């Protein structure tokens, strides 16, 4: 951004290979492919009946920022794993420029509808020499200030320095990213992405329409869930199998939900596991206007969870690998041999009658120490293609 670069400024250190923001929507394509194998994998380790939400577009936006630095095949597996490798071409530095495009188009809205805010940032070790080109590409691309924080000293106020900073931009919603003895002594920078959203429902719900249910859950006993009500025309479609797929456009109608629910009785994971970017823009395209009868509950759900163990699975594992880690962009003069100790992500979501609110964040961390009658539910930048959250809900009670 900045203005409008002919993607003619300086973007070097080690480059991998395997109206032209088609650039950009490749990008978007990647990061949804991403999206959905990541849900996947998520869901794979998580149980059936419980609840799920991240930002998938995040993760993607920590892990760009840290391969920055990356090199070899580090830069490789990175590369391919966030599906950056199915783009234009030769240039694991251009993909900064199109996601720092497409961050732009995103978060830089000359239309003011709903809120969505970004914020990057570093917090290196207040000792170290950090490359000065690394620092300052973070600065322009990703918009990511390099803040020092005191780990060989301090690791705890350190750690509790980043949540506080994240809480700060997620609007208190975000807050322990960075489980409890995840930074220590040995912590050289902590890559970090954080993402809010809250907007209004371009058709709101009545409170007074809105009543208390009764939820039977997995075993044993129910819980009192508000349940709302609505009636109008809205984009909808009743998939293969009898599954439903409904999307509430907040106001805008440049984001909006999109709930997926299984025929009743009928296994959500099958749709999980046959769940794709191309299924996804299938079910978007089958979509019709129309006049029908929403019901779906008021509540909110927070997610957590490590990235390493589902991401190691998919192929990212040089970076986590303390012998085959490859950062040597990152610090120029200081502790070297680095490598991703573990990466964190936390997403919270809100829905209510005047509209929904989800803030999520992403926070790689190097060298440190490692380690219900549910639907699904998107928040999709329809002109952008992006999945900017996604979930399971399990249980409105909460």
């Known amino acids: 951004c900045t203005a409008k670069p002919r993607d003619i400024p300086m973007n070097p250190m080690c480059i991998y290979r395997s109206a032209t923001n088609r650039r950009v929507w490749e990008l978007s394509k990647a990061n949804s492919r991403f999206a959905t194998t990541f849900y996947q994998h998520l869901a794979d380790s998580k149980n059936d009946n419980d609840n799920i939400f991240l ?19 580090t830069l490789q597996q990175l ?25 732009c188009r995103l978060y ?3 239309n003011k509808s709903s809120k969505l805010v970004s914020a990057n940032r ?7 020499t950090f490359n000065e080109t690394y620092q300052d590409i973070s600065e322009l691309v990703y918009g990511a200030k390099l803040q020092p924080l005191d780990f060989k000293e301090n690791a705890e106020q350190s750690r509790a320095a980043i949540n506080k ?25 902590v890559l970090v992405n ?32 508000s349940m709302m009500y609505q009636e109008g025309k809205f984009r909808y479609r009743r998939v293969a199998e009898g599954t439903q797929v409904l999307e509430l456009p907040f106001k805008g109608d440049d984001i909006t939900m999109v709930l997926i629910l299984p025929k009743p009785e009928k296994s959500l994971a099958k749709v999980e596991k046959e769940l794709t970017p191309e299924v996804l823009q ?63 992500h936390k997403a919270f979501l809100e829905v209510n009658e005047e509209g929904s609110e989800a803030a999520a964040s992403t926070a790689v961390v190097i060298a440190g120490r490692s380690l219900n009658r549910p639907f699904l539910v998107f928040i999709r930048e329809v002109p952008l293609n992006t999945i900017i959250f996604m979930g399971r809900v399990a249980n409105p009670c909460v």
């Open 55 to 73: 930002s998938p577009l995040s993760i993607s936006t920590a892990f760009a920022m840290t391969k920055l630095g990356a090199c070899n095949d």
């Open 79 to 103: 590369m391919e794993v966030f599906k950056f490798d199915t783009i234009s071409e030769k240039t694991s530095d251009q993909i900064h420029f199109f996601f720092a495009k497409l961050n």
């Open 108 to 110: 830089r809205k000359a």
């Open 122 to 128: 570093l917090f290196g070790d207040k000792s170290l």
């Open 165 to 189: 900073w994240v809480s700060n931009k997620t609007e208190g919603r975000i807050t322990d990213v960075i489980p409890s003895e995840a930074i220590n002594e040995l912590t050289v920078l």
């Open 194 to 225: 954080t993402i809010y959203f809250k907007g209004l429902w371009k058709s709101k719900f009545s409170p007074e329409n809105t009543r208390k249910e009764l939820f039977y859950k997995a075993d044993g006993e129910s819980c009192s869930a």
């Open 282 to 344: 299938e079910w978007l395209d089958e979509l019709e206007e129309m006049m029908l009868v929403v019901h779906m509950p008021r509540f909110r759900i927070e997610d957590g969870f490590s990235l390493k163990e589902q991401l190691q699975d998919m192929g990212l594992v040089d970076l986590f690998s303390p012998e085959k880690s490859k950062l040597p962009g990152i610090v120029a003069e200081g502790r070297d041999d680095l490598y991703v100790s573990d990466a964190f």
